[PDB]
Amino acid sequence: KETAAAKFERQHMDSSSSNYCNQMMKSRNLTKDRCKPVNTFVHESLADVQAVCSQKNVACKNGQTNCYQSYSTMSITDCRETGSSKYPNCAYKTTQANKHIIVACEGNPYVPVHFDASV
Amino acid sequence: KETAAAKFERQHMDSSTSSSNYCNQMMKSRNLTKDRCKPVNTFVHESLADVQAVCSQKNVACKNGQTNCYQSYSTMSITDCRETGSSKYPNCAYKTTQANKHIIVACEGNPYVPVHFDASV
Numbered sequence: 001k002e003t004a005a006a007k008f009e010r011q012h013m014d015s016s017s018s019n020y021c022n023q024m025m026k027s028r029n030l031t032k033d034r035c036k037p038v039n040t041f042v043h044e045s046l047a048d049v050q051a052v053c054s055q056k057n058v059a060c061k062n063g064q065t066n067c068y069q070s071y072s073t074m075s076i077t078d079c080r081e082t083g084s085s086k087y088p089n090c091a092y093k094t095t096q097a098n099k100h101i102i103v104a105c106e107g108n109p110y111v112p113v114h115f116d117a118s119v
Numbered sequence: 120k121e122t123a124a125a126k127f128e129r130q131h132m133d134s135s136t137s138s139s140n141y142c143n144q145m146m147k148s149r150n151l152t153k154d155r156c157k158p159v160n161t162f163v164h165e166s167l168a169d170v171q172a173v174c175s176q177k178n179v180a181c182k183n184g185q186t187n188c189y190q191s192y193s194t195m196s197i198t199d200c201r202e203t204g205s206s207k208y209p210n211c212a213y214k215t216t217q218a219n220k221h222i223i224v225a226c227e228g229n230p231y232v233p234v235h236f237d238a239s240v
């Protein structure tokens with residue numbers, strides 16, 4: 001099966017338009033069987049995002065203790081399904097932002113396996 | 120010089136659209152039979168932006184051992200061109216086969232774009 005680390009890269013990494021989310025959510029298989037309603041893409045190097053696993057330790061939403069917040073803000077894009085969107089014509093609003101990210105980290109190598117939030 | 124990116128587009132991109140004679144016409148018109156019959160060549164029938172986006176998708180080892188290859192998460196419409204046994208330069212002859220497959224490309228540069236077609240899977 002796809003590893004959690006690889007799923008994180010597919011869902012959330014774009015090291016790198018109003019139609020950005022429409023193209024990306026499709027290209028990442030996030031519209032295949034249903035429209036994933038909410039998603040964030042991070043526009044930093046893979047190395048910079050993996051380094052978050054060595055930064056500020058914080059609680060995960062689910063109560064676990066292996067979450068980490070980036071010290072620095074990062075360039076991200078929030079994709080959120082519009083009010084009119086109906087599968088299979090998934091439609092998204094693209095919003096660019098610079099924010100801290102919070103990821104859960106696991107494994108060897110110790111890397112992000114889940115996107116918890118942006119703050 | 121032709122840039123590596125422009126060369127990838129000439130050799131491997133055909134968004135415009137494949138007949139039984141598609142490869143014979145296309146390998147000739149894209150100058151892939153100029154100095155020899157190029158033995159294997161793939162044309163991708165997706166938008167340039169969709170193919171360019173593969174440089175941020177699944178990182179996989181290249182056939183030559185370099186680490187800068189990327190596999191598309193979704194399948195893409197492609198046409199494979201393979202030289203026939205009867206083919207004799209300069210009258211290069213090809214078998215045309217359509218498929219829907221994940222593509223693997225090598226990417227380089229700033230911007231980070233496709234410069235080589237490695238394989239389909």
Ligand SMILES: Cn1cc([C@@H]2O[C@H](CO)[C@@H](O)[C@H]2O)c(=O)[nH]c1=O
Binds near residue numbers: 159160162235236
């Ligand atoms: C296996 N294969 C190979 C090729 C071409 O052959 C060269 C071999 O060095 C590559 O650089 C490609 O230009 C292709 O287009 N499609 C494909 O599936």
